[PDB]
Amino acid sequence: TTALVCDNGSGLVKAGFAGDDAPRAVFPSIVGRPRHQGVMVGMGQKDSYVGDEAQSKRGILTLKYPIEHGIITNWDDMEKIWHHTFYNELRVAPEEHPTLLTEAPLNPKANREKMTQIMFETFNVPAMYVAIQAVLSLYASGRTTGIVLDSGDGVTHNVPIYEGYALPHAIMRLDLAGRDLTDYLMKILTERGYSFVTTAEREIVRDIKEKLCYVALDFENEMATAASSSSLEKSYELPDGQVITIGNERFRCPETLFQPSFIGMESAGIHETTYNSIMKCDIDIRKDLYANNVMSGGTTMYPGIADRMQKEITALAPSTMKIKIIAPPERKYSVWIGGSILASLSTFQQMWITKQEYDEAGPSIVH
Amino acid sequence: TTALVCDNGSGLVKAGFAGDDAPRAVFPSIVGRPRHQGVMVGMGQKDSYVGDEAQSKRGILTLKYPIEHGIITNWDDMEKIWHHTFYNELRVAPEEHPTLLTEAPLNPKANREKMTQIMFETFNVPAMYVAIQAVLSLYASGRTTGIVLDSGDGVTHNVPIYEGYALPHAIMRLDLAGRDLTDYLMKILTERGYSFVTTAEREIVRDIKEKLCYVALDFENEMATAASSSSLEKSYELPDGQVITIGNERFRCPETLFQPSFIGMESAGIHETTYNSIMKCDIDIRKDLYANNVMSGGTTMYPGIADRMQKEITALAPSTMKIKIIAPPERKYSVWIGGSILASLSTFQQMWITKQEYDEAGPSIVH
Amino acid sequence: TTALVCDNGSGLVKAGFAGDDAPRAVFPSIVGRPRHQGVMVGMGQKDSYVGDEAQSKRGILTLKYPIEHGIITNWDDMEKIWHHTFYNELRVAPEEHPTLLTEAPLNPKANREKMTQIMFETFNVPAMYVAIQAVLSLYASGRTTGIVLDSGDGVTHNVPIYEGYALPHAIMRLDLAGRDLTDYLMKILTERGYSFVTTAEREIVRDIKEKLCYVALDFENEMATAASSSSLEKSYELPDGQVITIGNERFRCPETLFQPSFIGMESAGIHETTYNSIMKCDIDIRKDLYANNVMSGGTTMYPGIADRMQKEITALAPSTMKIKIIAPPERKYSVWIGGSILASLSTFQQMWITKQEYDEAGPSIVH
Ligand SMILES: Nc1ncnc2c1ncn2[C@@H]1O[C@H](COP(=O)(O)OP(=O)(O)O)[C@@H](O)[C@H]1O
Ligand SMILES: Nc1ncnc2c1ncn2[C@@H]1O[C@H](COP(=O)(O)OP(=O)(O)O)[C@@H](O)[C@H]1O
Ligand SMILES: Nc1ncnc2c1ncn2[C@@H]1O[C@H](COP(=O)(O)OP(=O)(O)O)[C@@H](O)[C@H]1O
Ligand SMILES: [Mg+2]
Ligand SMILES: [Mg+2]
Ligand SMILES: [Mg+2]
């Protein structure tokens, strides 16, 4: 009956039935084993904690993110993520619903095969399909044309779609935002004598990466008044009681995303990968990619975009073109709000890969 | 059969079966041989008197404490303590019950083996285990987080614990309180012209260390009003009828522990060893070590602590952090009431070292 | 006039003019004030002794290293270090030369500014520059490619360099060896019944860390032969006439630098940090990072590396890729013999930060 949209984020895995409100459960993609000797003898502990509870047990575990640079490390950790998601969040049996899974646009073969095969044999679902996360972000703002910028930890993408076809030859995948921003924040906060090295404490870096950062309009000129002894200091409080005063590094960390040359890699800035994906599309269609520029994903929630992005695009594109960048509030749930629209609707009600078809065809059902 | 918790005090050896009230026997850990020439000729007097009988025969013996600086001096005296303890207090044979023994956290190797080994061949016990005295103090107050203190005459320890694991990197052992406080009390009672030198009479010094002593809120401000003519004098009476009036030195002796520069040693104050053991724990756990500071051991019974310790820590700790320091009645028996809770409980009924397994393994069994 | 290279040791300050032999003066940085009351009104006693004289007057002082966890404690003690170093060792006046100072590759900013500024106002030197300690280790063995190690009591570092560019993305800082090895030797020597707790005596432990330790080739098998009566026992003689017999623990203390699991801290050994810095470098260059592995410092002077390090890396590295590990003699003076080659060579004779430029610009001239 009711289909299930379960999003394999690298965040922030999101789980909720098909429509109509919001993700039922969201928690960080963490499994963590206990690194210290037991001496109270309940015994009372698990062999492996998942999140939320692996984020309540900080400082006693060794956190292992099972998805790293756009790929899952091994399915031994992945199945334990899955077991936690179905059972102590959604509560429903896996044999009850057809499921809908998400992937990253341009993900390595044979990691969709191996996934599909393992998931059928481990949880015994009755039907399934895998839709890519960028394409789904079209549905959330309900547009049939435009270039989609879907940016989440740890893979961003630039996919062009026109009424309502996706060009296979103009899709760009960057392995950059947001975990490299997390690692960079840890590298420029060490620069003020605040050292973070332990895995649990690495989460604190994420919590200040969320809340306290912002982006400039013109970097060099916002940087200029930062050099003056004028306040940009906001004072954060740390869990053990420590008080940190950051100012410069606060706008510096997300600004890193414009120009990967700050980490020295040859990769082009979001400025130019957006533009170069548009300029791999056909000449006539370019007219309508402007003003259907749609940003998405959780790593676009800094309170200093899109007007940085705006000022940058308007400078690089042709003269007198209508360029408005549509960025809805609460971009982090865009993908899920996509998935919800698909699986609740017909036509695609008769289009899942069903069990008899899977048994007959085998795991080689890629296209 | 019911288990036996027999606690290897540094005091004050304590003995009583597992559960549920108080130890049956507590008495000074002393052996004393008769030093003066014999003339009564009944005769039959014992070669070595143990406590408490060696404390009702003061002035005719030469007391030799079998435990000094937290380690047992020789097993010739120790076996006579043991034989006396089981037989002439409890009235039971060690063959009947599994035992539970205690140690000092960070006790020199190879003195846990030789102990374990000698006890199997001397008393023919069916099973045993050795738990460290600091860890056991958690059970007494039902804590699942917090820093634990076994402070006895004369080895103290400082162990931080988080639910329900031990931290190898945060544990500190001081060979400071309390026998050096006794020896210091005898050295500063010489300052008022009352000189004591004999071992047996040293016990009287311990008895005034118990009853008369107290700690200040602020040393310097109690010291100021001590210089005034107003009375802090309490009049003690001595075993042969003599009257001593001490006042200034009365609050000075336990105050010595708050910074042992009085002795001359470089060793840090309890104030700071408490704090510095906390700042060797992981950052997110520190939040809950504050306000689960639980004191223990008989040597913490001076009336002025813990509110000296409280006022001192709140000054050294980060701003606006909650620090409730827990120190109720029962602290002299804290460790033992801990041991009682363990040996009655399952799972740990199957976790004693039993004789066949010992026979196979040998005395190399530690870890 | 000839420039002066004075190396701001983590240890262990080294001082000597630009080239070409060895440093004139080496001593382990300690300052010690006199802690007991004077009883000879002679008296002649200085307020602060530096080393050598503060290592001759052990047991009546409280030794304080001015550089702790890779940063100077405060400039009140540091300025007295400096004044002693230039004046009462090297004899030359700072007013007569450009000087050359060393730093860590990654260290709290702006404590390189404050340093540079205070040193200019206190000693009023004609010109200066601050070079990182890791880069200089290339010069010492005349390498044009390779990964550099400054490991001193207590900062290690891992910097990859390619002819003659430094790669920012791959620089890794470990706050691991060697003072935590000093603390670890003190923590496992209490396990054999010899206690060392007071400040002066802590130096003696450090001296036994120098001479008698060694690293195993195969850990598991060295542990096997330790359990038998097969002698690995060496007899040390101790300052007050005492005899120390160490076996197993002799190889246990340095083994800590592999596998930080022994302390429980979340980090990976030199084995893995070497690899993890290489696999953060661009693909083509990796070919010459293998076989230009250059070890350095004083805390790599154990007589059981590098062929352990080699056998371990060779197992983890890609198959049939040749890996030479070059550890020269002289490693304690590596940094200094590096600095010496640079400051004697033009072109960089005209590139010191000079007084007129400093006076106009202020502390920001650092970058
Ligand atoms: N307000 C915010 N500002 C900046 N970054 C944020 C904010 N909220 C969340 N993030 C980042 O966004 C990430 C979540 O992105 P998400 O949309 O879940 O990506 P995915 O769906 O691919 O997992 C988190 O890792 C977090 O670091
Ligand atoms: N009321 C008191 N005030 C101060 N000290 C006391 C008091 N009662 C006992 N003590 C001291 O505490 C010691 C006993 O401590 P205890 O908890 O038995 O240590 P352990 O268990 O390690 O032997 C005795 O040596 C005695 O000097
Ligand atoms: N033969 C040796 N074996 C092991 N360690 C040594 C030896 N000689 C010196 N050390 C250690 O090396 C340290 C000195 O390292 P050094 O190169 O001076 O570091 P830095 O230059 O950063 O101060 C000393 O603290 C000492 O403990
Ligand atoms: Mg995504
Ligand atoms: Mg005790
Ligand atoms: Mg160094």
Numbering used by the authors:
A (entry chain D), B (entry chain F), C (entry chain E): 5 to 371
Please share text taken word for word from the publication where this structure appeared:
Utilizing this approach, we obtained a 3D reconstruction of the myosin VI MD in the nucleotide-free (rigor) state bound to F-actin at an average resolution of 4.6 Å in the actin filament and bound MD. Local resolution analysis suggests a gradient from slightly better than 4 Å in the actin region of the map, where large side-chains are definitively resolved, to around 6 Å resolution in the converter and lever arm, where only the contour of the backbone is visible. We therefore adapted the molecular dynamics flexible fitting (MDFF) approach to generate a continuous atomistic model which captures high-resolution features in the best-resolved regions of the map by enabling fitting of large side-chains (blue) while avoiding over-interpretation of lower-resolution areas, where the influence of the map was restricted to backbone conformation (green). No density was present for two regions of the MD, loop two and the Hypertrophic Cardiomyopathy (HCM) loop, consistent with flexibility, and only the molecular dynamics force field influenced their conformation (red). The resulting atomistic model (‘HR’, high-resolution) converged well with a molprobity score of 1.44 and a clash score of 0.41. In myosin VI we find that the hydrophobic residues P536 and L535 of the HLH are embedded in a groove comprised of I345, L349, and Y143 in actin SD1, with clear density peaks to support positioning of these side chains. Consistent with this prediction, the large loop 3 of myosin VI likely makes more extensive contacts at this interface than myosin IIC, with MDFF suggesting probable interactions formed between D574 in loop three and K50 in the actin D loop, and E575 and R95 in actin SD2. An additional unanticipated contact is made by myosin VI R561, which forms a cation-π interaction with Y91 in actin in our model, discussed further in the next section. E354 in loop 4 (A355-C362) of the U50 domain of myosin likely forms a salt bridge with K328 in actin SD3 as supported by clear density for side chains in this region. In contrast with myosin IIC, the ordered myosin VI HCM base likely forms an electrostatic interaction with actin, as MDFF suggests a potential salt bridge between R393 and E334 of actin SD1.
